[PDB]
Amino acid sequence: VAAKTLLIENEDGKGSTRMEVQDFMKRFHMHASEDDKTGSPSTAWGTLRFPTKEATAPYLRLSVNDDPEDALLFVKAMLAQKYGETYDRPSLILSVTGGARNFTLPPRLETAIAKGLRLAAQRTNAWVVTGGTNTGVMKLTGQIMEALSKTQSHFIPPTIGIATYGVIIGGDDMTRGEPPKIGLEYEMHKKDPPKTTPLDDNHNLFLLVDDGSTNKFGKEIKFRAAFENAAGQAFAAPVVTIVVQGGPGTLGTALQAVRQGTPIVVVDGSGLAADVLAYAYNFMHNPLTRFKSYTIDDLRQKVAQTFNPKSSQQLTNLLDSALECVQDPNLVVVYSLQESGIDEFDDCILKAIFSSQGKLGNKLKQAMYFDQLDVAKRALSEASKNGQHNEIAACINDNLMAAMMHNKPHFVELYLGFDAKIYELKPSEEVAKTNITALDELPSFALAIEELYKREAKKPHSHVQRLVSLSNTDVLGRHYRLANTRAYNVLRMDQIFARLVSKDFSVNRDFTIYDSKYDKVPGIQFRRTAQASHMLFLWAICLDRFRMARHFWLIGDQSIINALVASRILERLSTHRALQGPHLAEERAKMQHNAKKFEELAVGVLGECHGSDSHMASEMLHSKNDMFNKKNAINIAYDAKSLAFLSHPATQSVINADWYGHLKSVTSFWAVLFAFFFPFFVLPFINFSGAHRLRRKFAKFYSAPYTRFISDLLSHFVLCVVTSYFVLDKLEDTISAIEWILLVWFVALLLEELRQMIFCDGIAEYISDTWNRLDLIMITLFFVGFFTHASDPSNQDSKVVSKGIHAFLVVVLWLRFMRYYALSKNLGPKLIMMMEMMKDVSTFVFLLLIFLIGYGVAAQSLLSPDEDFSSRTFIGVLFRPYFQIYGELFLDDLNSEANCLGDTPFTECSRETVRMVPFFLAVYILGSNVLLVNLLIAMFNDTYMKVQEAAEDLWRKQNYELCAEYKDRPFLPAPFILLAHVHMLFMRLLRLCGVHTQEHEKIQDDETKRKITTFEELNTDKFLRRWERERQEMLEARVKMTNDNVVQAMGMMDQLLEHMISFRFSLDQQA
Amino acid sequence: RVKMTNDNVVQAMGMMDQLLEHMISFRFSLDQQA
C-alpha cells in the first residue's frame, strides 16, 4: 500500500507540496530500447521487498537523459515518505566506487575503513552512493552500511545503490505491472537475460540508470557523478569518493571526479587500481626516500599488471589516467593501514573534507563531527597565523550556533576561546517587527536563542512545545489565558520558568545595557556576558544538557543562586504534567540525576566559601541580588526547598547571626532573660554593636527576633498561668475582672491571628500550620466559654458547664507551649520525631482496638447477662478493659461483681458459666502487655533509627522559618499587641489616605558587590579545581585510565613490533 | 600501590615513546643508508 499523495519539494526549496504520485513520476522516464529518444513512461519503480530485508526499499528506474533535479526530487519524496517533512539533512556525500569483482583486502584495513565509514555515517548522517553491485567493494560497503543501520536506531542514513537498468534481474518483471509497485517482491535469484549480477540488497534505495541498451557497463558513471554534483549543489555538502581496489571503470570515475573538482579517497594497499594510484601518489606526490624508487616505468608495469590492457595505446591511456589521478594532490587522499594506522581512517576522511575550497563556515561546520576538534584547532591556529582574522570572525558566530546546536562543548569552548563574544550572536533568520515594545526591545542574540527554541520545538514529540502548550499564558508572558509565531521568545520562557520554580519571581532583564552609549563603562562587558551566560544557561537547563549548562554556569557569576534555581527548576520539571508520559520517564530520571548533580556543587562552592572566609561568606549570603527580585539567597534556598543546603553549618551560622541580630553572640539564654527582666539596669552594661547612642542601642536590642521569642514565650507563659488561675478559682455571680483581662487578652490574640491571616503568605499555608490551627481552637473555645459564662452569670449549672469546657481549653492551652521548645538543641528534633511517631501509635491503637472491643463485649456478656441494654452496657464494654493494659486490672472489683463468696475468689459462684472471666483476661492481658506493648518498642527503635537525621534537617528548616516569622512579628508582647496593631493601622491609614509615609532602604555599594562577585568567582573556580583534583583521586577512574593506557600501550607495542618486523625485513633484504 | 603502578605505566609510555623514536630514527638511518 503506497502513499496516494507525494510531498514534492519546490524549486525554491522552502517546504514541500502534496501532489499526485503519477504526475510526479510522469517527468521520470525509462527506455525500453536504445533507439527511442523519449523511451517509455516510467513503470519500473516503487517498493522492493528484498529477501532478509523487512524495510520497503524505494527503487526508481530513471533515464540517462533525464534530469538530476528530478532524481533529487524523487530522493526528497522518498525522504518525505521515510520520516515525514522533518527529515535529517545530510552534510556529506560518500561514494563507494571501485572493484566490482570480489577482490582481496586486508582485514584490519577494511575493518578500519568500515569503522571510519560507520563513524562518518553516524556523525554526519551522510548519503552513501553505491554502484549497485551485490559483490565486490559495493558488497563490503553495503555490509558496513547494514552494520551502521543495525547499530544506529531512529533515523537511518539513506544508502542508495546507483545501478543500471542495462543489468535487469527482475527489472523487466518490475516494468511488468501497473505503477506504483507497492510491496513488489524483488527476486534477485530470478534469471532474466542478459543480467549477470544481483542488485544492491543491502542499500536503502535503488536507482537504475536507463538507456535502453543491454549488457553494456559504465553507462551510469555520468548519472552518478551528476547526482553527486546535484547533492553537492543541493545541501551545500562536500562529496568524497571512497575507492577500494578498483577495475578500469573505477579509474574513469575518479578522473571524472578530479576533473569536476570532487576530492577522492583511495584505500592504499588494497590492490588493483588503488595500488596503482598509491604508486602514482608515491612517485608524483610523495617526496620521501622510500617512495623515491617509483617511476613511470614501474607505474606502467603496475598498469600492465593490474588493469591488463591488450593494446599499448590502452596502456598509455591507463598511464595518462593514472597520471591525471595524481595530477591534483589536494583531491587525492591515500589511506593505508601500515601508514595511517587503525584509528586514522575517519581522520583521513575529515582531512579529505578539510582539503576542499576555503569556505571556512563549511570547513569548521563539517569539522565539528565525530567528537574531533584537533583539526579545527589547528585550522584556527593556521587562520590566526595567516593573518586572516576577518573570515574567522565572520564564521565563528555560525560555528558557535552550530556547535551549540549539535552538543559539541569542546567546539563551544574552542569557538568562545578564539576571541569571540557570545553576546554578539546573529540569528539564523530575520526578525519580524513587533507591535509590542517588550518584544521589540530585545536584541538579535535573544532572537538567536528564540531560533534555538524554535529548532528545539521543531523536533518531534518535544516536551518544550508541550510545556508551552500547557502553560496557558499570553505571548507577552502574563497569564491572560502573530502570537503563535513568536511564542518561543525569551520573556515568555522567563515567565514559564518563574511560574514553575516558585511563586512571585520576576528577574531583572536589563536589556538596555547592550546599547553602545553605555559601552564605555569598565564593567559592562562582564555584565552583558553575565546576561548572555544566564539566558544560554536557562536554555541549556531547558534542553537538560548538563555539560553545556555546566560551562554556562562556569562562565557566568552568582553560581550558588543560579545552581539552586536550576536545581529547583529540574526538580519541578520532573513533576510537571507536560513532561510526564510513557517515554518521558528515563529522561526525567536522568534529568533528576542532573538535578542532584546541580544540588551537590553549590553546597561544595559554599563549603569552599566557608573555608575561605566566614565573614565574607556572611556578607555574601545577606546580599540581595538585583536580578533575583531583590531577595536574599537564603530565601532562594527556601524556595529551592533543599534540606542539604540548610543543614550546612555556614548557613546555620548565618541564621544564628540573624537570630542574635546586631547584638554580639556572647550572651546565653539566661543573660538575654535577665536583660528582658532588667532592661534599664543591663543595657549600658551589655556589649553590643549622648542618649541617642543608648536609644539606638535599645532600638537595636528590641529589634532582635530572639528578644521577640523571649517576649512571646513569656507572654504565652503568663497567659497559661493566669488562665489556669482563672480555671481553678471559683466563678462568682458577677463577672470577675480577671475574666475581663483574659477577654481583652484573647481579643488581642484574635487580632494577632487576624494579622497573621491578613498578612499571610497564602491562605493555604495558614491552615497548614498546626499551631495556628491550635490557636483557632483556642480562640473558638474561649468564645464558647465566654458566651456560656455570660449567657447566665447567676446560674451555677452554667458556671460548671463553662468550667467543664474550660477544662478542655486548658488541655489545649498547654499544647501550644511546644512551639517555644523548637529553638532548643535537644527538645526540637525529639518533638518533631514525636509528631512523626504519632502515626505508629495510631496504627497501634488501630491494632489493639478490636482486641479491646472483643474482650470488652465478652466481659460485659459474662459479668452481667440476663440484663437489658443501656449506656451502662457500653460502660461495661469499654471502660474496664481499657485500664487493664496500664496496670490496675480490677480483679477485686470483678470478684465483687462476680457474686462469688469463696475464700479463693472464683469458687462457689452462682453460675458455672461466669468463671471463664479470668481466662479471657488471662488472654487479653497476655496479648496486650506482651505482643502489642512490646511491638511498639521495636517500632520506636526502627522509627528512631530511620528518621533521626530527617528530624535534624526539618528542625533546621524550622529554624530558618522561625527566625523569619519572629523577624516578621512586631516587638511588643501580647497584652500590648493591640496598641502595636493600632499603631500599624494608623501607619497604614497615614500611608493610604494621607500618603505622607516614607521609608529608606540600605543601598549596597558597587565595589562591595564587585568584591563579593570576585570572591564568589575565586571560590567557584577553586571548588571546581579541587573537585577536579578529587574526582581524579578515587580508585575507579584511575584504574580506568590505567586500563586505557595499557590498551594504548598495546597499540604502541603493535606499532613498535610492526616497525621492528619492517626493520628486520629491510635488514634481510639489504644483504 | 595502584598510584605507583599508574606512575610506572605513565613512565612506561614515556620509555615507549623514546623507544619508538629510537626505532623510527633507526628505520630512517636504515632507509638513508641504502
Ligand SMILES: Nc1ncnc2c1ncn2[C@@H]1O[C@H](COP(=O)(O)OP(=O)(O)OC[C@H]2O[C@@H](O)[C@H](O)[C@@H]2O)[C@@H](O)[C@H]1O
Ligand atoms: N557497477 C557494476 N556492478 C557490477 N558489475 C560491474 C559494474 N561495472 C562494471 N561491472 C562489470 O563487472 C566486472 C568487474 O568489474 P571490475 O573490473 O572489478 O570493476 P570496474 O570495471 O572498475 O567497475 C566499475 C564500477 O563497478 C563498481 O564497483 C563501481 O561502482 C564502479 O563504478 C567488469 O568486467 C565489468 O564489466
Ligand SMILES: CC(C)CCC[C@@H](C)[C@H]1CC[C@H]2[C@@H]3CC=C4C[C@@H](O)CC[C@]4(C)[C@H]3CC[C@]12C
Ligand atoms: C467539639 C470540638 C470543638 C471539641 C471541643 C470540646 C468541647 C468544646 C466540647 C466537646 C464535648 C462537649 C460537652 C458534651 C456534653 C455536654 C453535656 C451538656 O449537658 C452540657 C455541655 C457538655 C458538658 C459539653 C461541653 C463542651 C464540650 C466539652
Ligand SMILES: CC(C)CCC[C@@H](C)[C@H]1CC[C@H]2[C@@H]3CC=C4C[C@@H](O)CC[C@]4(C)[C@H]3CC[C@]12C
Ligand atoms: C484503643 C483505645 C485508645 C480506645 C479508646 C478508648 C475509648 C474508646 C474509651 C476508653 C475509656 C472510655 C471512657 C470510660 C468511662 C466513661 C465514663 C462514662 O461517662 C462513659 C463514657 C466514658 C468517658 C468512656 C468514653 C470512651 C472511652 C474514653
Ligand SMILES: CC(C)CCC[C@@H](C)[C@H]1CC[C@H]2[C@@H]3CC=C4C[C@@H](O)CC[C@]4(C)[C@H]3CC[C@]12C
Ligand atoms: C481452645 C482455647 C479456647 C483454650 C482451651 C481452654 C478451655 C478448654 C478451658 C480453659 C479453662 C477452662 C475452664 C476452667 C474451669 C472451669 C470451672 C468449671 O466449674 C466449669 C468449666 C470451666 C469454666 C472451664 C471451661 C473450659 C476452659 C475455658
Ligand SMILES: [Ca+2]
Ligand atoms: Ca564564573
Ligand SMILES: [Ca+2]
Ligand atoms: Ca499565630
